[PDB]
Amino acid sequence: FCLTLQNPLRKACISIVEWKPFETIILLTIFANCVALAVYLPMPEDDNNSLNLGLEKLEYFFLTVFSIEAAMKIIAYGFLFHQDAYLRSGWNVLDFIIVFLGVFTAILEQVNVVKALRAFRVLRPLRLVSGVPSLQVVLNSIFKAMLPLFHIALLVLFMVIIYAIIGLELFKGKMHKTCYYIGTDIVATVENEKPSPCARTGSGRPCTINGSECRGGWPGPNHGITHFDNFGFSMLTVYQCITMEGWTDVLYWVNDAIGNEWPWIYFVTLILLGSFFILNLVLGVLSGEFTKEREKAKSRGTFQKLREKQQLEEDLRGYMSWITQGEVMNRVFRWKCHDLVKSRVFYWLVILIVALNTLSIASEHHNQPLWLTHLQDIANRVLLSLFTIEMLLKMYGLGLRQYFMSIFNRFDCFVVCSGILELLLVESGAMTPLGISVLRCIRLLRLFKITKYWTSLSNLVASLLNSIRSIASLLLLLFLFIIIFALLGMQLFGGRYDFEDTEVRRSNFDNFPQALISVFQVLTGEDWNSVMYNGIMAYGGPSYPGVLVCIYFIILFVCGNYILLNVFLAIAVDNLAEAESLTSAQKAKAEERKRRKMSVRVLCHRIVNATWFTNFILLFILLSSAALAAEDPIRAESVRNQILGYFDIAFTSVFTVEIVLKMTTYGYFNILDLLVVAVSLISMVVKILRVLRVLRPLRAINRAKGLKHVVQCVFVAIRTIGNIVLVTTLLQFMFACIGVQLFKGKFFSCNDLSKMTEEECRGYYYVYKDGDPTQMELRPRQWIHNDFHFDNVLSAMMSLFTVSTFEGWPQLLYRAIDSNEEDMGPVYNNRVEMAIFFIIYIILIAFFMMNIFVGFVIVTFQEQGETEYKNCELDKNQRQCVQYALKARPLRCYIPKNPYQYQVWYVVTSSYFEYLMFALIMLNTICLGMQHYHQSEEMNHISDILNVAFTIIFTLEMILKLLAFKARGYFGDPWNVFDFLIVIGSIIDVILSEIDTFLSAFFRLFRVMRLIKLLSRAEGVRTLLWTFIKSFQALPYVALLIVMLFFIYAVIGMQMFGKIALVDGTQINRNNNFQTFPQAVLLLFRCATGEAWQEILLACSYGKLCDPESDYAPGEEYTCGTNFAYYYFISFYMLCAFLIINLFVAVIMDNFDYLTRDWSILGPHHLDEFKAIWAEYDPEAKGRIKHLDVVTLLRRIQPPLGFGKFCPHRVACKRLVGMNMPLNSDGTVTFNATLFALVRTALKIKTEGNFEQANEELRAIIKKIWKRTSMKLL
Amino acid sequence: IEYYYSWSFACACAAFVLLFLGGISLLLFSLPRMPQNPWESCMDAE
Amino acid sequence: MSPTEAPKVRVTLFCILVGIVLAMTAVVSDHWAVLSPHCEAAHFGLWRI
């Protein structure tokens, strides 16, 4: 704010004017500009209205102000080295780039007296954030957590590439055939089927439309967006499957192409690998990054601020009662109402009239009886009095000064007043036609009074409200991020959905309210592919300019779901840490209070004691189960179902013998193993006993010692968690009861949308196919009720659960926005303000209230990592680090002899060779991405040549890498074992290809799998893959509950839902079904990812028609399915979600050391580089090296462990000697304590004398003896 | 005109099912282990 | 020793030695195509048909 190369003030006075409101008169100016973009209404094909013609003048006015002021800051400074300076701060580079490109589009639009340069105009709400420096530390809290997620993002990119070149080579050009009406170009479907690929005499679906034939002139399955037949459309359709919206459409379109049995392994392996497993790494690095910063907020000063001011507040509220209870004390009558209140008579009988108010509210429903209408005005008039009695008792009988001091009594006086507001307003004839129900929505506040009865989360609800200058500083910056993308898509896509189809694309970008709703839907992830397909068909199509629209919705979905993880996860982590530590400090505050006031048989055991017997039971449990697996649902008479039915009596020989044998030696888990055979013997209603036969696996978690341990750790984690799960189900219940006041009776609708009520919705009507007004067909019209609706509290909670998950919530948003009146069909964009119900519900539940479940688990499983306390001399890192130095073992590197052979060896392992082969692999990928569909023949041959040309080269790196290591050393390094595997199968790719032309697809995949050798160099990524793959193998039991839970739910599902017929057009079709056990498991997987599971649920509920290969008494075709489907599917979604974030959190808490490593100080990545240079002197292990080597060995080490960047004549001549070391012979010094000695200089500096007490901390902190302390003490 | 098998298909599509599955198991049983701990390395002495 | 003396590697290797002949069954058996016109049945293999 000075010059140094300054110009006199005459022109420098300007600097004075810049004082306090000068910044805020132009910060007020820009909020007027943001409204000036939000009322611009985009209109198609160069059309306008009056208000956009008076706004373009306004743009000119706005531009000038920015320019005048962005000229009066470079000359409020001065010269060229003073506008050099203003620019210097990067916040004023954006402020110049906007307003210079601002006047550029006032010029070029006035020369042609363009519209893609009218979209830099949307960047001006960022100029708003440079003005408030309070938010510049908030963006820099989001950008600062992105440099750790670097090595994850690079790993997603070598999987979106790998599955693209796999999916190119297999799936290219297959999906170009559809059923067509004979001799037309009209594609044939059923009413509710989207058009799919078919095959002629293959394994695909044969066309079965009647008068339909299968031909190949078809462009693709979503107009040609999602196919696999060049590298850009293979990479766009794989990226779609990773985000898990509509991966089961790509899977089922391949099953109607090439066939049914092989392509499932592509989509399932991919989904798990790039979705359920990347999302494990993202929630580990991010979880560890938010924990290493709370330690650096512990270590600056910030702990006392939420402790002192907390305890300065509760001592302030307590010191107020020591005066104000003596401001009052005036009869016996004013005292006996004080003994009344604090007694348990009152706190257990005011909870009686809260429960009368819930039951009054939770009995509203549509078409309710006239008595229960009349009852609820009596019970409102009563419960308004009983709240008013206990307020007038409270405002006088204990004084109005204690009353106002409370946080919760402030609510009560309002509720009594706002309840008596209604009985004065509605008893007037001043009914106010909408406010007669708004004040019915008001009295819904009375059930928020029950929140006071928790008193278990009021260390979190307290800790919440301490952070609401910080909660809201993030929910603003998310809310600013939408308003750029809300308004960018009003440019690109406003108007522009001017299709001539008769279908509705309601998630469009026409207004500002609508654009905002659309942007949000793509952030919840739900159905964003439809919003993207419309943006590609809004431009040309699947062409070269039209498809770069697709990178709007990639920057939108990636970088917008990145902000969601930096807010909800962080809030739940930082806010949860305080709500726990303060409760754990109310531990130590309270137990220090309570101590002040106090102060033949014998053969049989051997027979079932032997290991073989225990294992003999297990392969009869692993076989008893897998006969339920292969059982036929549809036929109770099959030759298979008989020959598997004999195993019901063939396995209950052995499980009958053992239970008699068990009860000789003896006489909880034990009774179930009797109970399994009990059902298995009585089954030798008949149907309902087969269901209880499913528990044959559950008698296998009595046998394993490991399987008992996991199910007990899960039941621990419900007794903890089951405080949050109950509060949500209270808050779920409130929003359910608003929805019955808004949307009750309103979700009826006729069949054609012209008939508004039920009396008119009779008779028949026309439908027009493809909107041709010549191709019409009768249908009867019928008044259909919606499926998921809000009509009582029970169905309103059914609907809310689905929205909370994120499935099918836009079809409830539009059924609500279009909602008209009481018993009447819809009206287009009637209530566009009722998008706030479904957004406030989602922001509360599905992004926040749920974020406390994971945050809670992550935090309270660092308490299982903190009920074990090891307060020795050594810090855990030191101790963990120390553990390294004891338990090591050197490597083998097999440096050769025979200097012919050596002459290869140095040339191979040099980095100008590692660059050479890691360029040829990079070139070999580009040749595989060149392949495409309807390519020419001059590519067909140079495809096949380079298939031979590369294969010879990676052969010739393998003959050389045999010569240098002489075989024994080549098969020691397991990348070379994989490299041997690739070289062979690549040769068989050549030979098997040519011998057909000289006279299968699997060996084409050894051309793509050679890319995985990139992992042999990325030490930052190969460590990250190793550390998370180490710990899926280390927890093989939690991943066997999820295996077991899919097994049980499939077999019950095959049982009840197995006879639903495969009509096509519904959700039980030839791709989705419970008619085998692989079909069922696959179906369960669809629901665990949440594809259309609520739309599956409706498709298997009693009404559905049975297949004819079943049997039934005829006249009962429409009888199968059952209303057990609601219990089946809602229970499955809640158990699987619990058992997955179980397995997610357990993997984080093994890598809790890596994830929070703090790379600066000392780690094993330094300690790896010891054994690297230790390999340089011992080729094979053999213990020791010479003493002269340790002179030269030590300069090879980085100064965070070794010696500095100085010339080592001063320290190393001393530190090698003056620091103690084990003294072996003249040419011997051991491996392990050499490593122990050099970390001891870095960490744990101990003086002379502690050579045995440092073996005392190395023998009490230590475990098993490991008697090598003789070579590790001194 | 059908296709049917009671000998060769179920032996050769057992021999495939044998040899593909045993060699992979033989492969996993001579590669060392996932190192589980920051000092171990595949290919470490003995 | 420890990769080659273990019971998991010697159970495995003998199970390799079983199915080495099961292909050699199929290499001289000709049985896994049964034609049925109805007589004109055929029995196809790898050499003999």
Ligand SMILES: COc1ccc([C@@H]2Sc3ccccc3N(CCN(C)C)C(=O)[C@@H]2OC(C)=O)cc1
């Ligand atoms: C059944 O399979 C699931 C999937 C997701 C979850 C929870 S909550 C949730 C609920 C509904 C839809 C998505 C979610 N998401 C999706 C948001 N993320 C992309 C940001 C999660 O990430 C949560 O998982 C975690 C560890 O974050 C739990 C079980």
Ligand SMILES: [Ca+2]
């Ligand atoms: Ca979804």
Ligand SMILES: [Ca+2]
């Ligand atoms: Ca979905």
